[PDB]
Structures are given as structure tokens and as C-alpha cells.
Design an enzyme around this catalytic site. Structure first.
Site, PDB file in Angstrom:
ATOM      1  N   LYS A  40       0.819  -1.182   0.000  1.00 41.36           N
ATOM      2  CA  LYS A  40       0.000   0.000   0.000  1.00 41.36           C
ATOM      3  C   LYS A  40       0.858   1.238   0.000  1.00 41.36           C
ATOM      4  O   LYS A  40       1.543   1.548   0.979  1.00 41.36           O
ATOM      5  CB  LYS A  40      -1.051  -0.055   1.105  1.00 41.36           C
ATOM      6  CG  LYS A  40      -2.302  -0.849   0.637  1.00 41.36           C
ATOM      7  CD  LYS A  40      -3.416  -0.966   1.688  1.00 41.36           C
ATOM      8  CE  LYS A  40      -4.773  -1.277   1.043  1.00 41.36           C
ATOM      9  NZ  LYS A  40      -5.806  -1.514   2.070  1.00 41.36           N
ATOM     10  N   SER A  82       3.037   4.321   1.252  1.00 37.45           N
ATOM     11  CA  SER A  82       1.936   4.995   1.951  1.00 37.45           C
ATOM     12  C   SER A  82       2.415   5.183   3.370  1.00 37.45           C
ATOM     13  O   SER A  82       1.909   6.004   4.133  1.00 37.45           O
ATOM     14  CB  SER A  82       0.686   4.098   1.946  1.00 37.45           C
ATOM     15  OG  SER A  82      -0.520   4.833   2.096  1.00 37.45           O
TER      16      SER A  82
END
Length: 689
Positions: free
Chosen positions: A73, A259
Site C-alpha cells: 500500500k 503509503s
């Protein structure tokens, strides 16, 4: 101390010579120096980036979807801002380039040669195949979409194509042995500038490329004129016609790091000085965009003007502006899954408080409706933007946000007001509502001007009722962008927890989780902020007259106040005065717009119908509500809608909020952004550029 200089991932010997070439000038001007390292492809580079043997790279809308995909992510660091031939945007359009004479209208495409920018890229893949979907004749994902394409096109040049699996798609990709269709510019007809050549070269019959790529590759309008375009109107149109003849207009590419612990700044550091002293006739000595025609389009896109730091809550889907991520997710479903979705309305229920109501509703809807709630309305809204969800009855002020983001009013929270009643509610003039500063009776003297530094009750910040209207006035008359010192201390749902205006706030029955936006705070909603004055704590509250009556002389039954006579409170008039509850049709703060189900226009209209049917499946109008479910009926809690809401009705053409809410309020509610605002409105302000 030297913050670790960054490490850009390159997917080819040129992407490296390039980072290398850039490297030179970095220590040369002595700005944030980098260190690039190689990983064959965009997807391959992503891994290094997250498992940090690297940190950040630039990628196409498509790949972001991937970059932000669970397995890894990652966060959309900074998208490329391109020239607009209008005003510089990120969102590029999607079209497919075609040789005039080849004339095979989009639909009429079955079995010809197809040149691609790569496997998975925006217009280069995710986008085309998806619209070529219907025609494809593919059961679904269990059977890889991958084979239907070749089975569809006699030939295709798709970089990063799983060639040995079904030859046919690398058929059109020239190349080294290895590099033939190896996902990098180590393959010609790749990316935009690469795939483009494909066509002109014969084997290339059609490609779908950047709404410029030709222009990119053609400085001769006579050689430009050499082309035509494929449009959803199935017919062909001109080149520059990419504005009125094209597929999907997706947001650009972007730089992305993990992220998690992005270095984001360090990153932006780089991009900034880079955009400051190279390219754009900044460094006649060196430049990053206009690069090589031998290995066209590099690290980013050549001539991709500049970029912008994507502010921080944006994650994959978020940056992807619903519509497109829809297309992409949809690329891995069955018409079943698909079909179903398109009519089985997703609703976001502001909190566990509403979450269950919908759950209930999810059950009686005969699986027609289904929900995932989100923390505060903002997140809910956001969610719809993310696309996981579809709707929620929003409050005027709240809706404001929606609009600024691109959401349009579908049906309004009609008052169920009395006058000359009939199902005409379905489409009745919105009676709007009357916010009023109902003061506690006994305390008479505390009038208008006098409020100066008191304890106050609020339905919330950024909301009509109490917030917006009142707040604006005060500030209008005090410039207190640091409000607090007007209202010594109050309780309003959503402010700084450690605000000097929340305090009064109480958490759940278990007194925890105070000062937040959700009904699971005994003081949230038109309701709870009433609980506030009655709880003899906050010494003044504003909201609509209706809320009063909603909970007076037995109208409501919770022990705390079921008892209070509606005569126990006065209503603070503007002109000093404090009128009676009932008689605020002189005394009120003002009339404001009700609530309304808002939506991504492109889902909305279909909702309108389902609601129209569904509401009559309940409603303080129909028969079954009395029975097994009530929508616009709560339990005074007023979840989703108000228990006093007749039916959600038709807007009066007021499609944009700028319409629905209207100039004055519209404008004033931004004056307020001035003093302080939300990251979300920021994000919108930033994406819907």
C-alpha cells in the site's frame, strides 16, 4: 543528520543514464541529491520502492491503483501536471489513435492489429479493454481477461505481456530477443511515444494513447492531418478532437512512495528544485522532460510540464476520482457482481450509530441496499468519492462539501410540513428550515448582543443548524477566526478535541469519545444539542424550531427531558428579543436549505428511482414503515434522515449545490473556510481542479 538522499527506481538503461544525467546537476547546484537504482518495470520498481531497497517512482493512473493495492500500500506522492492547451491539468483524456483509411469504427474492431502502451496502464490498457469489454465475450476473471484480448485482436503489442502463455499479444511488439515485449522502453511501442510509432510502421493498426502523443510525435500539421480518432459515438473524428471524441479522461501519473514513511518531503524537495532549475528554459545546460526520441517518454513524461504535491489523506482510490477506479475494479468482476452493484445502492451511515440502521435496512431491502459506514460525514462523503459507497442524506452545509467535490443533490429532505398535504411531498416546494437560537426560558436577560462569552450548544461545526449560520454572524461581527474568545467555551461536535469550545461535550453512555462528529455522542444532531440546553449545562443553543417540538411535552420520551414543557424555553430573536418556541417565524436566525441525498451524478439518477420506489416501501407516508421499517423515521435519533421527513423529494432543478444551497449561503460558507477548514475540502479543492 544528512537526510538519506532519495533513490529513484529506473526500468531501463536510459531511465538510469537519465537519473545519472540529472544526478550530475543536483550536486552541481547542490540541491537534494538522489541515487537511482534499477528494477525492470513499473511494477518491479514498485516493489523496490515499498520494500525500500528504493523509495519512490512515477507511474500512470492505472499503476497507482496497483501501487495502492493492499499487497503493497503506497501513497500517491506527486502527479504530473500537464499542459492543458487551456489551463494546466493532471487529468489526461483517453482516445485511440487510428490511421484514416483503416476506418474500422470502434465497435467494428473485431480482429485487427492492436498496439498498446503496456499491460495494465491507463489508456494503454485498463481503459481500452474495458470498453472493448462488452464485445469481447468473456465469462469473467476466472477465465483471464488476458486471453479474450488476443482472441479479439488478430494481433496486439502489449508491453509486459505474458507472451509464452498465448503468443498473439507480443506478436506486434518488435524487439531484442529478451526485450521484444519486456515492460520498459527496452521495447519501442511502449508508453505513449513508443506505442505510437507502432501504428505508422504498418504492423500498428490502432493504439490508444495520450491526448497529445501524436502532437507529441508530430510537428507537421500535414503529417498530423495524416490521422483520425476513434470515439464512443462509434464513429471517427479529428485528432485534436480528443476533447469531443474520446474514451475516458483519467488523472495523470504521479510519483509515489510507500503509503508508509514516504519521505514525501524529501521527495517533494527534489521535484521542486528539479522543476526550478531544469526544463522550462530554466537550465539551457540540462533538462528532464524534452529528452530522447530514441527512447521516448522517460521516468515521467517528456514535456509533462510540472507537478503538484498531492496533499496527505489521498490513498490509491482517493486520487483516482471514483469513476476511473470504478472502471478498473470492474475489470476484475462478473456481470453478476457488476450488474448487482450498479443497482444495489451503497449507503454510508455516519457511524455505528447509523451503521446498524442501515444494517437493518440492508436486511429488509431484500438485499437491494447495502452499507459500509464511515467515522464522520466527511469520511462518508469521501468514501463515495473513493467509490466504495454511493449515498447518504447530507445536511445542507455538509452537502456544500459534496458539491465542491462534484456531488449533486438527488432528493431533498422534505419537511413533512403541514399546509395542504398529499403524496405531493414526492415533489413539493422545499420549506427549508428555520434555525433559531432557543434560549432557556427562566434566564430571560441573556438576550442577543449579550451572549458575549458564554457556554454554547452545537449540532456541529460546518453544519447548518447551529454552526454555519450562527458562527458566521459572530465572526461577521468580531473577526474571531480564533472564535473561542467569543464563546468562553461550548460544545460542538467536531472541533479540536482539546478545543476551548468543546469541553461540555460528553461521550457515549460510558462517557468516553467526547467532542466528535457522530450521534454516538449524546450531544450530536439537532437532537443532542438540545439535550445540551436541557442538561442545564450549555447556556444557549441554535437549531431549527422543529427540533424543539421534536422533543418537548412528551413529543419524545427519553427520561432526561421527556418531562420538559415546551414552555421551558425561549427563542433568542436577532432584535435583542427571545420569542416563543412556536413563534420563530419572525424571531429565527434565518431559513436555510434542508438536507438531501447527494451523489456522484453518474449513479445518482438511477438512485433517484430506487429511492422513489424504496421510500414508499417505508416512509411516514407509506404503510410498511408503520410495520417492519421506517426510513425517514428514526427513533428521534434522526439517522440518515429525520423522523419528521415526509419523503425525500425532487429538487427544483437545483442540481448544483451552488443552486440548491444558493449564492448567499454558498458564498458565506466559504468565507468561513477562511478561518479554518478541512483536509477533505482541501483535497477536493486539489483534485477537482
Amino acid at each position: 543528520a544528512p537526510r538519506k538522499s532519495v533513490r529513484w527506481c529506473t526500468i531501463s538503461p536510459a531511465e538510469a543514464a537519465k537519473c545519472a544525467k540529472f544526478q550530475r546537476n543536483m550536486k552541481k547546484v547542490r540541491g537534494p541529491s538522489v541515487s537511482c537504482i534499477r528494477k525492470t518495470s513499473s511494477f518491479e520498481c514498485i516493489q523496490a520502492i515499498a520494500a525500500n531497497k528504493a523509495d519512490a517512482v512515477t507511474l500512470d493512473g492505472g499503476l497507482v491503483y496497483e501501487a495502492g493495492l493492499h499487497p503493497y500500500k503506497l501513497r500517491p506522492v506527486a502527479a504530473e501536471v500537464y499542459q492543458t492547451r487551456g489551463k494546466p491539468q493532471t487529468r489526461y483524456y483517453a482516445v485511440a489513435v487510428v490511421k484514416k483509411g483503416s476506418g474500422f469504427q470502434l465497435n467494428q474492431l473485431q480482429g485487427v492489429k492492436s498496439c498498446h502502451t503496456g499491460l495494465g496502464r491507463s489508456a494503454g490498457w485498463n481503459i481500452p479493454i474495458g470498453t472493448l469489454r462488452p464485445y469481447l465475450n468473456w465469462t469473467g476473471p476466472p477465465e483471464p481477461l488476458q486471453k479474450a484480448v488476443a482472441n479479439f485482436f488478430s494481433a496486439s503489442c502489449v508491453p509486459c505481456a505474458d507472451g509464452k502463455q498465448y503468443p498473439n499479444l507480443c506478436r506486434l511488439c518488435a524487439g531484442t530477443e529478451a526485450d521484444k515485449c519486456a515492460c520498459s522502453s527496452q521495447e519501442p511501442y511502449f508508453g505513449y511515444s513508443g506505442a505510437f510509432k507502432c501504428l505508422e510502421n504498418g504492423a500498428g493498426d490502432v493504439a490508444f494513447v495520450k491526448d497529445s502523443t501524436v502532437f507529441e510525435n508530430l510537428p507537421d500539421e500535414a503529417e498530423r492531418d495524416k490521422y483520425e480518432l476513434l470515439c464512443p459515438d462509434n464513429t471517427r473524428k479529428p485528432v485534436d478532437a480528443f476533447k469531443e471524441c474520446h474514451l475516458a479522461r483519467v488523472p495523470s501519473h504521479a510519483v509515489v512512495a510507500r503509503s508508509v514513511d514516504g519521505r514525501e518531503d524529501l521527495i517533494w524537495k527534489l521535484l521542486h528544485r528539479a522543476q526550478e532549475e531544469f526544463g522550462r528554459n530554466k537550465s539551457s545546460a540540462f533538462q528532464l522532460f524534452g529528452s530522447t526520441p530514441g527512447e521516448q517518454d522517460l521516468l515521467f513524461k517528456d514535456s509533462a510540464l510540472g507537478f503538484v504535491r498531492i496533499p496527505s489523506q489521498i490513498d490509491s482510490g482517493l486520487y483516482l476520482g471514483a469513476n476511473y477506479l470504478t472502471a478498473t475494479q470492474n475489470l476484475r468482476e462478473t456481470a453478476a457482481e457488476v450488474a448487482a452493484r450498479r443497482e444495489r445502492v451503497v449507503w454510508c451511515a455516519v457511524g455505528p450509530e447509523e451503521e446498524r440502521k442501515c444494517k437493518q435496512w440492508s436486511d429488509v431491502s431484500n438485499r437491494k441496499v447495502a452499507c459500509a459506514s464511515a467515522s464522520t460525514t466527511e469520511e462518508c462523503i469521501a468514501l463515495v468519492l473513493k467509490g466504495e459507497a454511493d449515498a447518504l442524506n447530507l445536511d445542507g452545509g455538509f452537502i456544500y462539501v459534496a458539491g465542491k467535490c462534484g456531488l449533486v443533490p438527488v432528493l431533498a429532505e422534505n419537511q413533512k410540513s403541514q399546509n395542504s398535504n398529499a403524496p405531493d411531498c414526492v415533489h413539493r416546494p422545499p420549506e427549508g428550515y428555520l434555525a433559531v437560537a432557543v434560549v432557556r426560558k427562566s434566564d430571560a436577560d441573556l438576550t442577543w448582543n449579550s451572549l458575549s462569552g458564554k457556554k454554547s450548544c452545537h449540532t456541529g461545526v460546518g453544519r447548518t443548524a447551529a454552526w454555519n449560520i450562527p458562527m458566521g454572524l459572530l465572526f461577521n461581527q468580531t473577526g474571531s477566526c480564533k472564535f473561542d474568545k467569543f464563546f468562553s467555551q461550548s460544545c460542538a461536535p467536531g472541533a479540536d478535541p482539546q478545543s476551548s469550545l468543546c469541553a461540555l461535550c460528553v461521550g457515549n453512555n460510558e462517557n468516553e469519545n467526547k467532542c466528535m462528529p457522530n450521534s454516538e455522542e449524546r450531544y450530536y444532531g439537532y437532537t443532542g444539542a438540545f439535550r445540551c440546553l436541557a442538561e442545564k449545562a450549555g447556556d444557549v443553543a441554535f437549531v431549527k424550531d422543529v427540533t424543539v417540538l421534536q422533543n418537548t411535552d412528551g413529543k419524545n420520551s427519553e427520561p432526561w427531558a421527556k418531562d420538559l414543557k415546551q414552555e421551558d424555553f425561549e427563542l433568542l430573536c436577532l432584535d435583542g428579543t427571545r420569542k416563543p418556541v412556536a413563534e420563530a417565524e419572525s424571531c429565527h436566525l434565518a431559513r436555510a436549505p434542508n438536507h438531501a441525498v447527494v451523489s456522484q451524478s453518474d449513479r445518482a439518477q438511477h438512485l433517484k428511482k430506487v429511492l422513489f420506489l424504496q421510500q414508499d416501501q417505508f416512509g411516514g407516508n407509506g404503510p410498511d414503515c408503520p410495520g417492519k421499517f421506517c426510513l425517514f423515521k428514526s427513533e428521534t435519533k434522526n439517522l440518515l434522515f429525520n423522523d419528521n421527513t415526509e419523503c425525500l423529494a425532487e429538487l427544483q432543478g437545483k442540481t448544483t449545490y451552488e443552486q440548491y444551497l444558493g449564492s448567499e449561503y454558498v458564498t458565506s460558507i466559504t468565507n468561513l473556510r477562511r478561518c479554518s477548514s478541512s483536509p477533505l475540502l482541501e483535497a477536493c479543492a486539489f483534485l477537482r481542479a
